[PDB]
Amino acid sequence: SWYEVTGVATIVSSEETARLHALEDALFKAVNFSGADIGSISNLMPLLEESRNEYQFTNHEVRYILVESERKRRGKVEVKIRVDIYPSATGCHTDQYKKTILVGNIEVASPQQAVMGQIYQVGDDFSRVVNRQLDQTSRSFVSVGTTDYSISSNYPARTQMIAQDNGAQYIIGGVITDLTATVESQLLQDDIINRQFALEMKVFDGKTGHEVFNKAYREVARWPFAKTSQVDTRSARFWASTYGEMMLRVSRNIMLDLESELSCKITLPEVVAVFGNTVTMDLGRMHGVKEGDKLQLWHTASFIDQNGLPRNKVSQSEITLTVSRIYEHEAELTIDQPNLASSVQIGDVMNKILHH
């Protein structure tokens, strides 16, 4: 995938070493954003010593470098390059802001299985628990609440709309497929009731509306109540019970599966609004955004490659932003180059700028 980046480096004693540092400056931006290994950049630099229009590399995430421009500007060397990168399947986006997840209300496929204890609302209550689990115990997620969301009747377009309205990058849906129980007799007739808890969970990408992954969970635990007892799945009493504890175990496993599956993915903040020199993004204090944070703006664009066909490229804008105000789940950023403010558009993406 192509990235268009720019770099700059002050000319001290040599225009040639300045050129190499500007190239490194630019490459870092592309490699970092792409999810490739920034540590492997040093291994490429010696090959850039000979000045050329284009470069090709083997055994490296960076495959091709096309230099568009290189000039001397106010005592500095500025470069603009196009880079084709293929990140390793082992790559991992680091120090990302937290991802916003929306928890759909978990449905009970067969209501009659909830007859015992009349726990028809167990799905809703479990979603509340999952929500709480993600918000206060996860490492990479911010849960923005629960809401009705079926995976039985699922359409990518409907999903995209739900996610957009709640600014979530992911939506978790689910269906409880088994709450059946079998009665047994250890010491007394029908003294033990073992109840199932089967849950099919699906996680959808808010952008595509397509499922990112799925997992089924099945557990069984003793139903610690007389079969005639009505149980309130909202009460602390229920959640402290053996069956409730088992569901809490599943909750933690869900959180772990989500972390293992999405933790390394990129969190890509987008412009949600622009007012003068101020931009608003839907990530805030809860996501790890801090007042000093610096971000780079990117635009998607098209170009003709060395083949003759149109290709998309992730293009780095000259625009960089500084977080000015932070709120719980959103933030305002001031554009560092106000003369360019009018070029910023809703939907443009940003990533955190790194020093190292």
Domains (ranges, CATH) in the chain?
1-90 (3.30.1660.40), 91-267 (3.40.50.10610), 268-356 (2.40.10.410)
- Secondary element (H or E) of residue 159: helix 156-166
Which residues are CB-neighbours of 130 under 8 A, at least 6 positions away? 103, 106, 172, 251, 254, 255
Which of 92, 96, 99 is closest to 38 using CA atoms? 92
Residues linked to residue 104 through DSSP beta bridges, in sequence order: 147
Helices (H) and strands (E) in the chain, counts: 5, 17
- Checking 218-225 for CB contacts under 8 A at 24+ apart, the result is 218/178, 219/246, 219/249, 219/250, 220/194, 220/195, 220/196, 220/246, 221/194, 221/195, 221/197, 221/245, 221/246, 222/192, 222/193, 222/194, 222/195, 223/116, 223/117, 223/181, 223/193, 223/194, 223/195, 225/117
Would you mind telling me the total number of residues written for the chain in this entry? 356
User: What is the identity of the amino acid at 146?
Assistant: T
**Structure-determination technique:** X-ray
Written as six digits, the tokens of 162 are: 């739900």
Buried b (16+ CB within 10 A) or exposed e, 76-103: bbbbbbbbbbebeeebebeebbbbbbbb
Q: What are phi and psi of 182, to 5 degrees?
A: -125, 135
User: Rounded CA gap, 350 and 96, in Å?
Assistant: 12
User: What is residue 112's three-state secondary structure?
Assistant: helix
Which of 159, 163, 199 is closest to 179 using CA atoms? 199
HSE-CB for 298 with a 13 A CA cutoff: 22
Please give the radius of gyration of the chain, using alpha carbons only, rounded to the nearest integer. Answer: 26
Buried b (16+ CB within 10 A) or exposed e, 203-231: bbbbeebebbeeeebebbbebbbeeeeeb
Q: Would strands 107-108 and 170-178 be described as parallel, antiparallel, or unpaired?
A: parallel
User: What is residue 76's three-state secondary structure?
Assistant: strand
Which of 94, 193, 102, 210 is closest to 157 using CA atoms? 210
How far apart, in Å, are the Cα atoms of 315 and each of 48, 82, 203, 240, 246? 22, 9, 29, 53, 49
Which residues are CB-neighbours of 231 under 8 A, at least 6 positions away? 117, 118, 119, 225, 238
User: Rounded CA gap, 48 and 65, in Å?
Assistant: 10
